[PDB]
Amino acid sequence: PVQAGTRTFIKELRSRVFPSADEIIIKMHGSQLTQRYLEKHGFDVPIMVPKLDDLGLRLPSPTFSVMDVERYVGGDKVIDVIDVARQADSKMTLHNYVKYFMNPNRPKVLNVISLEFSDTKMSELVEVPDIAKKLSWVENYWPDDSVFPKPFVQKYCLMGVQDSYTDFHIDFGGTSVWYHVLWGEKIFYLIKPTDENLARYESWSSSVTQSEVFFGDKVDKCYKCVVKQGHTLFVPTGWIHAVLTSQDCMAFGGNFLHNLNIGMQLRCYEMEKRLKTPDLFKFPFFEAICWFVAKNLLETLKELREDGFQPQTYLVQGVKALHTALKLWMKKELVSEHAFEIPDNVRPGHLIKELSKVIRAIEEEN
Numbered sequence: 001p002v003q004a005g006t007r008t009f010i011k012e013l014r015s016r017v018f019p020s021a022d023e024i025i026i027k028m029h030g031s032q033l034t035q036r037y038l039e040k041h042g043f044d045v046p047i048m049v050p051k052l053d054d055l056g057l058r059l060p061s062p063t064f065s066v067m068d069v070e071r072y073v074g075g076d077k078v079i080d081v082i083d084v085a086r087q088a089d090s091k092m093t094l095h096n097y098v099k100y101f102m103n104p105n106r107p108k109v110l111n112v113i114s115l116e117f118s119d120t121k122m123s124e125l126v127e128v129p130d131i132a133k134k135l136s137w138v139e140n141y142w143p144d145d146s147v148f149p150k151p152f153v154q155k156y157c158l159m160g161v162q163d164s165y166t167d168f169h170i171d172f173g174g175t176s177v178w179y180h181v182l183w184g185e186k187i188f189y190l191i192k193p194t195d196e197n198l199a200r201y202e203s204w205s206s207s208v209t210q211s212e213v214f215f216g217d218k219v220d221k222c223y224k225c226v227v228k229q230g231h232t233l234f235v236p237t238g239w240i241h242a243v244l245t246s247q248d249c250m251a252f253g254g255n256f257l258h259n260l261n262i263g264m265q266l267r268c269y270e271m272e273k274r275l276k277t278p279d280l281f282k283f284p285f286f287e288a289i290c291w292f293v294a295k296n297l298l299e300t301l302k303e304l305r306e307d308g309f310q311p312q313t314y315l316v317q318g319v320k321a322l323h324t325a326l327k328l329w330m331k332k333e334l335v336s337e338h339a340f341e342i343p344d345n346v347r348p349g350h351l352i353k354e355l356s357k358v359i360r361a362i363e364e365e366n
């Protein structure tokens, strides 16, 4: 049995020719990637931005080394590290990983994909794509006065050696991402969130054979997307993807929720609940933000109805979806474990009704 992350498994991965991600991804320039665009055409396929022009993406020169990270962040920090051959989580000092990295003669393949650096000297050196900041629920709807700490998941630094591999997952909470390769090369394997595929993914995720079964074989199309130095990949809600670090690589990235695919975001959250994913501890107060969002989304639909206007499709879909999930989390039987995410401001039962009544009309009123 070929085990994931092992050199044998890597020979096969490097051998398969996959349908090109050119079949589905949209290439565009910095300046085309706007809220306006995405509201009209949707954000349902990865968007590749070959040049970083007009993204608002500010980051270190292409020479920024693993050693420079160690400085700005602090070698003392204890970071998560993947033993790729074992597909398990390890810990070590940033200082050591840099030693391990800096030396050829790597006795094993070790990846760093989760090193969030907002609260460090290094943060000053990085500004995320304007588009991620424009869409992000944290940027738009997180009150300056809640008890829940603000999630910091916008600035990640990724260092990985050749043959680092991450297996097929859906990002925590169903968040979208951007990734930028500073040097080296990453290769994403991408799988559309059809229902066939999601379901198959939940199955595979809770099969004990998971690490012996390449989930790419289980779906009709698994798209290969090679992200080279200086390019910028944007992956939308729910997309199932694996990643291969084909060359020693440093990348930057960030995660964010937004209003476009609220339904898929919820589906993904409720699925990660079912699977008990530790990933979900990176966005602990997903539910809280959802409440804050339903407030704002309600207000917008109230303004459109009070003036005879018709709301865009994605807003009706999303609101209906929020409504279903707030209602679920409030059921008397489930309510004991959701109640703590209920922000002090919002009024659970009231809000849910105001949503119910708004969603009637729109339906019938259309």
Ligand SMILES: O=C(O)CCC(=O)C(=O)O
Residues within 6 Å of the ligand: 111, 113, 114, 158, 160, 164, 165, 166, 171, 186, 241, 242, 243, 244, 245
């Ligand atoms: O580059 C990697 O190995 C994985 C990137 C990614 O998909 C993640 O960390 O969530």
Ligand SMILES: [Cl-]
Residues within 6 Å of the ligand: 136, 137, 138, 139, 255, 256, 257, 258
């Ligand atoms: Cl967000």
Ligand code: NI
Residues within 6 Å of the ligand: 169, 170, 171, 241
């Ligand atoms: Ni990912």
